Structure formats: structure tokens, C-alpha cells
């Protein structure tokens, strides 16, 4: 049904839906609960409700996501990563900051510490922005009739690339191999890296009576 724990999840076949309240203690008087509604083949549908207020209002509070399990393959051996995600969102009062993002994590080996992270921001509310060393975009890329600005930043020992859309995309359908190939050809991402994890979900900062519903989400690695 609906679960509220900090680390609990609703595992299904080939999908794992987390709650991931990894920065819960940075907010004062908040809560969050996620739940998987319907499953149909590779299609998934889930929802997340939350309310975060006060505290460090400049930090991410959670990354409730829907990750996919797959064979750990190198980038050069990946043919296509077709992905479709349709979502709707509903906030209540105001002072709202959040984000809807895809995460790709790649490392040197098939089981090791992340060395490259790839954001794909499909919506940015309330002034939430990607991590950037200089605060300015370093590339403009059009993929599948959808504009994107690319940002580069450090996070510990990890390099975070970020493809931020120019218009909010409530209905997305594309191929992640395009982004990966652009990064390998132009930005210098090694082609021998192992794509560790793929996931997609919300990323709130501040909200009140907030709920995001994924009407459909499908992905695969070929």
C-alpha cells in the first residue's frame, strides 16, 4: 500500500521503488510517503506525497525514485535505452521548490563507487537548479525535439553532468543513448565506464501538501 519509512521501499519485478529520505534531518516538521499503484508489464505507476518546511530550505530532502535493475553493461556496448515517463504534480499553498530528475550512475567497474553522475531535469520549480562549478551552462543540446542546457559540477569525488530542459516536460519519451553518446563524444566521458544505476523520480526542497503521480514509466537497456 503506502509506506512512510526513511529507507523502506516497494520492490516489484525488474523495478524497485524507494522512499529515500536521505536528508530528512535537514528539515523541521516534515513527512513523506510513497506507494506503487498499478503494474502492467514494463509499465509502472507510483505516487509520492510529502510536506517539508523550514530548516535548511536550500537542500534536497529526499529522492523517492523508481529504479530499474539490469545487466551492468559498458557504455560502448549499449544500443538503446528507450524511456517513457508521464507524470502530473499537485502542490497546495506556496513556497514551493522541487524537481523531477533522471539519475544515471556510472563507474569504472560493474560494482564500485560512482565516478560519473548524469542528471536529466524534466522540470524545475521554485528556483531549484543543477550543480555547477561556474553557475553557467556549458552546452546547448537538442535531442528528439527537446532543448537542453548542460551543466557540469563536482560532488565529492564524482563529476555530475546535468541536462536541464528549457520547457517543463510532463510527458517525456526519448533514448538515453543519445545523451550518453553526446557526453562520450564531446564532454570527455570515457566509453569504457559501466552504467551502474538508472532511476527517475522527484527531488523536493520545500513543499506543503504535495503529491506527484506517475501515470506511466517504462525503461529498458539493450
Amino acid at each position: 500500500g503506502d509506506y512512510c519509512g526513511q529507507w523502506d521501499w516497494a520492490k516489484s519485478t525488474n523495478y524497485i521503488v524507494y522512499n529515500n529520505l536521505w536528508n530528512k534531518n535537514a528539515a523541521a516538521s516534515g513527512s513523506q510517503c510513497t506507494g506503487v499503484d498499478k503494474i502492467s508489464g514494463s509499465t509502472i505507476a507510483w505516487h509520492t506525497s510529502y510536506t517539508w518546511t523550514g530548516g535548511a530550505a536550500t537542500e534536497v530532502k529526499s529522492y523517492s525514485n523508481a529504479a530499474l535493475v539490469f545487466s551492468k553493461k559498458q557504455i560502448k556496448n549499449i544500443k538503446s535505452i528507450p524511456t517513457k515517463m508521464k507524470y502530473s504534480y499537485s502542490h497546495s499553498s506556496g513556497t514551493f521548490v522541487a524537481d523531477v530528475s533522471y539519475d544515471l550512475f556510472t563507474s569504472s567497474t560493474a560494482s564500485g563507487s560512482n565516478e560519473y553522475e548524469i542528471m536529466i531535469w524534466l522540470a524545475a520549480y521554485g528556483g531549484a537548479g543543477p550543480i555547477s562549478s561556474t553557475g553557467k551552462a556549458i552546452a546547448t543540446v537538442t535531442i528528439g525535439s527537446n532543448s537542453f542546457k548542460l551543466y557540469k559540477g563536482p560532488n565529492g569525488s564524482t563529476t555530475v553532468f546535468s541536462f536541464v530542459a528549457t520547457k517543463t516536460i510532463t510527458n517525456f519519451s526519448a533514448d538515453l543513448q543519445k545523451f550518453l553518446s553526446y557526453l562520450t563524444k564531446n564532454q570527455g566521458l570515457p566509453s569504457s565506464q559501466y552504467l551502474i544505476t538508472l532511476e527517475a523520480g522527484t527531488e523536493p526542497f520545500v513543499g506543503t501538501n504535495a503529491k506527484m503521480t506517475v501515470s506511466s514509466f517504462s525503461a529498458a537497456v539493450n
Binding site: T58, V60, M119
Partner: peptide, 13 residues
């Protein structure tokens, strides 16, 4: 100005 955290920056627009 942009105040940045682990993997996200925020600016009070």
C-alpha cells in the same frame, strides 16, 4: 546568488 549543496543548487528567485 547560487548556494549549492551535494548535487543541487538553489537561488532565491
Amino acid at each position: 546568488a547560487f548556494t549549492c549543496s551535494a548535487s543541487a543548487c538553489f537561488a532565491p528567485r
